[PDB]
Design a binder for this molecule. Structure first.
Ligand SMILES: Nc1nc2c(ncn2[C@@H]2O[C@H](COP(=O)(O)OP(=O)(O)NP(=O)(O)O)[C@@H](O)[C@H]2O)c(=O)[nH]1
Ligand SMILES: [Mg+2]
Length: 532
């Protein structure tokens, strides 16, 4: 055979623990060394100690909770996972979250303790966490230093020896999982796939199972590390497929590729279309025009299958777009790329979640993605529901108090509390996503001096006493500033907002009066004295 000598794995680790550095050592070690494609579906050849040469496929994985779905699809493409832990940090929020996603996909997990070179490295501690928190055999852990290439070979041997080979039938109908993708100006929309059953080759007539759309394969291969064309990809392989595909939304992550003529029985399970959770209005800033902004968004969207947006207008700001993102990082990523890659200046509103509103006289509940569209008439509202998430937090004991007070301030309900070790606390909180996206990240970071980490997962919608607040400047209402808040938190948010603009607005002549109203009732006033 030969598929018996294949190894499909990924690296999962909390941000900064050394994922990239380690992947570099692996490629370097194995020899794997402008129309430049992101690292993905990298094929490597490794001659093990047992004398045999193995074909290893490194699947790159997202690291932020925003790309959780994408992360799970990549894990579904592997047989194993290298769980990288910083020896000087120990297990953190994403370490645990990823570990469980790996477990959920029945992956063989190889814990790798990185940064053993650091003076602050504490292996015995980390080994202790691995056993008590993860339930893994401390002795299975591999000690390494990706910075100094220490333990690389040991990792490659663990991959060969502990991770089982792919199991599929190349003679069966094609069945390939799409775990990633990107837009290639020449090849078109290309999908990075894991082949479970069958084979695929140029000229083949393929079909996407979620849509039933068909294409003719023009090229297949993998990164070696450069995009290299192969004659085919067979059961067990990881690579890419080009087939004159218009855009990345035609080859959605998690979808299944099969043959149009002889389609596989069922698609790989777990497909889910992209699901925006956080929206914000984006308007041109400075000299940048609406056209340039729209042009930039169109060009950007080509390479992003999750983003959505639609024209939006505000009296003050004018013409802009209501954009939906997977989360705060996704939003940040998009902003930086519009300004840095298309060089447009933008003004972004405070982000907001999607509310479900039930109004009298309207049978179906409405999804509100823009606060401006939240009904102005409170009496017409029967109820409002907002998304909630389960937040997991890991922090040194010393900061538990301030953190608990923060979560509670943000309407969090504690569900669990455990000790990862004598000085490390684990916390689980059910919190509204709307509270988490305002300033939770920086507050939790400053109070923990950056030592606390957190992760979260959507757990559903729940009714809440939410209301719409409007912001007025010189009796002039700025709909772009209207926002949704819980009735009990309204007063504080109002003050913060007013006090925020009191500084954000440039001191000038005519006194500017900032008011935050609650259905016509001013509940926060802030005015900046006229110049002179
Ligand atoms: N001392 C030491 N530093 C290391 C080691 N591995 C990585 N680093 C350092 O840690 C920093 C972050 O490493 P990197 O590999 O980028 O982390 P990551 O997990 O890929 N981060 P992200 O998910 O954001 O891409 C870099 O400054 C890098 O040089 C190691 O074994 N020892
Ligand atoms: Mg990295």
């Amino acid at each position: 055979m030969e598929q018996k000598n294949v190894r499909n794995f990924c690296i999962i680790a909390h941000v900064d623990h050394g994922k990239s550095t380690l992947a570099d050592r692996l490629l370097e070690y194995t020899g794997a060394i402008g129309i430049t494609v992101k690292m993905q579906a990298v094929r490597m050849f490794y001659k093990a100690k047992d004398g045999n040469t193995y074909k290893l496929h490194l699947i790159d994985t997202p690291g932020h909770v925003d790309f959780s779905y994408e992360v799970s699809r990549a894990l579904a493409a592997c047989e194993g996972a290298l769980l990288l832990i910083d020896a000087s940090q120990g297990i953190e929020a994403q370490t645990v979250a990823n570990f469980w996603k790996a477990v959920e996909q029945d992956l063989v997990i190889i814990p790798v303790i990185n940064k053993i070179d650091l003076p602050s490295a504490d292996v015995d501690r980390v080994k202790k966490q691995i056993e008590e928190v993860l339930g893994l055999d401390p002795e299975e852990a591999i000690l390494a230093s990706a910075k100094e290439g220490i333990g690389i070979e040991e990792i490659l041997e663990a991959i060969v020896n502990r991770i089982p080979p792919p199991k599929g039938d190349p003679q069966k109908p094609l069945k390939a999982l799409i775990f990633d993708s990107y837009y290639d100006p020449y090849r078109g929309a290309v999908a990075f796939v894991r082949i479970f059953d069958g084979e695929v080759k140029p000229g083949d007539k393929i079909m996407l199972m979620s849509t039933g759309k068909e294409y003719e394969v023009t090229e297949v291969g993998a990164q070696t590390p450069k995009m290299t064309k192969f004659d085919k990809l067979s059961a067990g392989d990881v690579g890419y497929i080009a087939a004159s595909i218009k855009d990345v939304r035609d080859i959605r992550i998690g979808d299944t590729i099969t043959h149009a003529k002889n389609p596989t029985k069922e698609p790989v399970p777990g497909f889910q279309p992209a699901k925006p959770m956080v929206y914000a209005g984006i308007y041109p800033a400075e000299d940048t025009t609406y056209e340039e902004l729209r042009d930039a968004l169109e060009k950007y969207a080509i390479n992003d299958a999750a983003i959505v947006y639609e024209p939006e207008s505000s009296p003050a700001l004018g013409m802009g777009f209501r954009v939906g993102f997977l989360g705060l990082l996704h939003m940040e990523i998009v902003q930086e790329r519009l300004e840095r890659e298309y060089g447009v200046k933008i003004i972004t509103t405070a982000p907001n979640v999607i509310y479900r509103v039930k109004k009298k006289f309207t049978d179906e509940v409405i999804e509100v993605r823009n606060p401006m569209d939240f009904p102005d008439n409170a009496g017409l509202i029967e109820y409002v529901e907002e998304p909630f998430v389960l937040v997991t937090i890991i922090t040194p004991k010393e900061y538990v108090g301030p953190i608990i007070q923060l979560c509670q301030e943000k309407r969090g309900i504690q569900k669990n509390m455990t000790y990862l070790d004598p000085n490390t606390v684990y916390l689980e909180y059910e919190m509204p996503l709307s509270e988490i996206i305002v300033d939770f990240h920086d507050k939790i970071k400053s109070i923990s001096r950056g030592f606390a980490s957190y992760d979260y997962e959507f757990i559903g919608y729940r009714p809440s006493d939410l209301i719409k607040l409007t912001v007025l400047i010189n009796k002039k209402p700025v709909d772009a500033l209207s926002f949704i808040v819980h009735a009990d938190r309204a007063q504080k948010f109002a003050r913060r907002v007013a006090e925020k603009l009191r500084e954000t607005i440039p001191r000038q002549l005519f006194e500017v009066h900032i008011q935050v109203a609650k259905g016509g009732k001013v509940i926060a006033s802030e005015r900046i004295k006229p110049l002179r």
